[PDB]
Amino acid sequence: XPXI
């Protein structure tokens, strides 16, 4: 999902 998100880069983080």
Add this chain to the structure above:
Amino acid sequence: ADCGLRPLFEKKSLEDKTERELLESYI
């Protein structure tokens, strides 16, 4: 005004170890 020209590379007429790979990709 001077954006994107690196002091230790473009400004000294030096190239980094992998930028050629980018240039060659345009051909």
Add this chain to the structure above:
Amino acid sequence: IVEGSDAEIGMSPWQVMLFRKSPQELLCGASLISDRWVLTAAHCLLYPPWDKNFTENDLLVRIGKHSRTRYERNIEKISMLEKIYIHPRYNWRENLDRDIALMKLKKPVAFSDYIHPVCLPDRETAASLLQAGYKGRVTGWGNLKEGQPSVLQVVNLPIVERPVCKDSTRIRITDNMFCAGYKPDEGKRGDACEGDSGGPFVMKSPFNNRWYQMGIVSWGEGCDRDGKYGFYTHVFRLKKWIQKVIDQFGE
């Protein structure tokens, strides 16, 4: 960065490290686009599903760095933030559409051999350079595999055709995104990874030798998986917003 190599000194002088103050930790990458404006991913600053919602005084930036962990005296600059600006149509609920944010430094940074801004593309540069098969460069201090590097990592990756990007994922891709990475038949690997997000995808223009930031590391499914690609915010498509924030400051 997966399957990259150590950056050379001053190779990416626009690279910025976004640091959480409490607890002390690397949050994300970012990029210097002038003496006082830093570009990053919105999800680095605001991602409510994981309870992320940072305010200006929660964060600092470190500019001019090479080492991930050492304090680099007389080389690095540590700056506070005056104000964060998130794209008003950033879509954190769905697919990270318009994943872009600006951060205003409390005081402009002095440029040096190690600190220097990247260019943002104009229409012609974007149209010319953002094409499948052309390569750009991603940099960061993120994980080496889906484990942290001693120094800044760099890898060059090819831009991938939109239908190939779309067939790779069930996530909804928009025109404010592009993807990059090698295909399974190309024999090479590489990707951004966790810790790299918010950092720049740059291209060196063959027309004027300048480095342009075409993308921001935005999202992906794992790191360096076969048949998966990294996704990047399309900076040029969001440039009118960037220009508006910068132009309206103090007016």
